[PDB]
Curated annotation (Swiss-Prot), chains A, B:
It comes from Homo sapiens. Changing residue 1 to A: Loss of antimicrobial activity against M.luteus. This is Antibacterial peptide KR-20. Residues 1-13 are annotated as: Active core. The chain holds residues 150 to 162 of 170 of the full protein. Acts synergistically with peptides KS-30 and KR-31, killing bacteria such as S.aureus, E.coli and C.albicans at lower concentrations when present together, and maintains activity at increased salt condition. Does not have the ability to stimulate CXCL8/IL8 release from keratinocytes.
């Protein structure tokens, strides 16, 4: 799940 | 992509 965590963080602002 | 934002906010912990 760590890739999903990181891309969710990347998408947020 | 408002649904993506909301899913990512709720997913993080």
């Amino acid at each position: 799940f760590k890739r999903i965590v990181q891309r969710c963080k990347d998408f947020l602002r």
